[model samples]
Target: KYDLIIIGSGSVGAAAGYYATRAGLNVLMTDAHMPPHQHGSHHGDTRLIRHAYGEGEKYVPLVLRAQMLWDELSRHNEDDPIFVRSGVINLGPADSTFLANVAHSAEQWQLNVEKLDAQGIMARWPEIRVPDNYIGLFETDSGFLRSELAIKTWIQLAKEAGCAQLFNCPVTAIRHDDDGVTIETADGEYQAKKAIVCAGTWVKDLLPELPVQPVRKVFAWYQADGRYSVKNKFPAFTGELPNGDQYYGFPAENDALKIGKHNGGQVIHSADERVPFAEVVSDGSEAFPFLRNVLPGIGCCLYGAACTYDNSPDEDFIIDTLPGHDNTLLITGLSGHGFKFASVLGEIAADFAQDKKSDFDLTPFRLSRFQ
Candidate 1:
């Protein structure tokens, strides 16, 4: 028996495990693989960390805390750079909601931002060529996270703090009783006084009552053909074209440039049984013919992969008390924008489990919000 057992070791799981263990709670974290294994959104080399969130400004405070935590982790481990300061550029027309939000955030929070005309962006970043009427909002504070490195480090840190991590262990069932919870795994069974379910795609499987909708996402890494370089002064880019959908891209530093659709993320049936691979999805070089129309005179490109996005009803967050299980807590759905806030979210979870209430307002993310 343990004080706590966390299922799934992605951003949320890793954070929960790290926070609990650091607080001297006997924690046991389990994952399907040694990690998310590129099957989920947590992989893919890079993840954006922006202070001005289009999803809502409510996340701004949490994101700020996360940046500090990333720095804390980076400083603790001098060898590893947990965060890369590539900066971030939000590209869109003057009236575009995405760009407006960025501008509004800058005005409200006094965030350091530069207004760039379309010509200015082309002048500064030759590889990025947008239409005549568009503009770019550059913020120095925001950048991309060394996602793979962060994930690996947190797991190691948790283990170092006496966390018993079980890899290759896929949880199949979780039953709750008066005293605690019992989690059924493919190999055996384990009991814990409190259970945190950050199981990602398998979240709905553990608690059918949860409205966690699985969404499929595709990522393409195109051969820059020497046209772009991510490590240079250039920053991550988010484009909200006239068509209304938003897509973002990383510089060509990590060997290849990465791009994917954010708002267009779709839901996958629970019984879909199909797992997408690099070969199965469109490589953007092939699927995104609009890239030529949007970003004319850019690199040609190659390579692609698929990832899973577990979404919730309102696409906010399902982090709150479980339906019928008193000792079980759930943190799922997230709707794809939860990664940057992982650190603060974990602190809230720790506070909730120990204090019966969190210091942060849980109004926006409570699971009971749905009911």
Candidate 2:
């Protein structure tokens, strides 16, 4: 029997295995498919990492530690960097709760954030066209992570650390008792002292009692002017429209700008029920109005792909021990904005699996909070 078993070798699982094995524990990691695949949320080329969190102030410490862990992980792949320092800008009305939270988090944490009015924003980035009423909270240190590469790198490092892996092996059952945990997979059954579940959208399938729902979301890339290029110092951004609709995008890379709507998506019963972007929305034109209003320089959409999000009731993360099964730690309900915290979450999972204490207060992410 292994000391720990990680179910799902995606963003968090891979890192947990890496840390667990490095800490001298015999770890086993299993995944339904090879990770960094498009079936989950970590497939996209990049994901934003903002320090001044708009979601909640409690997330500030977690993300701060997460950034340090990301930097530590980056050292393993010096030639191919895991993170890009493009900076990030959060755009919304001056009185919007999201922007207020961002500003408050920055002030409370003493993070380097600049509050810029529409004119100030336009002066710095002429390619963007925000309305006069909108304001921008610019985080100079925040940026995006090379999501797939980070997972791939973590898996490789875990393997190097003597972590056993079973890819393309779908786990069908997990029976845990006071003795140990037995996981039945397509390949075979394995036993471990403890198990950590990070199965992404399929998490609900493993523990049907959890209050998590699978959401199908889409994102696309478009041809844009050179002024919007990352090489030209254009920052990745999130914009909130007057109607409260939210959209996020990345700076142009290879003449293509990536954009995605943050809110509003189809709630699928399962991960397999997700359809292609075109099938869900025609030509991905839902973002056209945002482009025409804020980024007039962008051209037609190039292509789009769909992914799944495991949303909790409050859209906050659910990272706690499985109720009535202390041997199993459950990490799910990341919502849409979790890749940035993968590093720290993985570290926390590893700690929990080993019965070690975490540095930060995890009360905010406890499953009991929902009760």
Instruction: Provide the lDDT at 111 for model 1.
Output: 83
Candidate 2 lDDT by residue in tens digits, 1-371: 99999998898898888888888899998888998798778887889999999989989999999999988888888788788888999998998999889999999899999999899999999888999999999999988899999989998888888889999989898897677799998788899999999998878888788898988888898987788877799999999999898988999878889998878887898666988878865437878878999999899998877878788999999988888888888889799989999999889888887799889988888888775
For model 1, residues 119-208, the per-residue Cα lDDT tens digits are: 998898876778899988888888888777777888888988998999888888888778888888899999888887888776776777
> Model 2 segments beyond 4 Å from truth?
none
Report how far off residue 6 is in candidate 2 (Å).
0.4
* True-structure Cα RMSD, model 1: 2.4
Q: Which portions of model 1 show Cα errors greater than 4 Å?
A: 225-227, 270-274, 278-290
**Against the true structure, whose lDDT is highest?**
2
Clashing pairs in 1: 230-252, 230-253
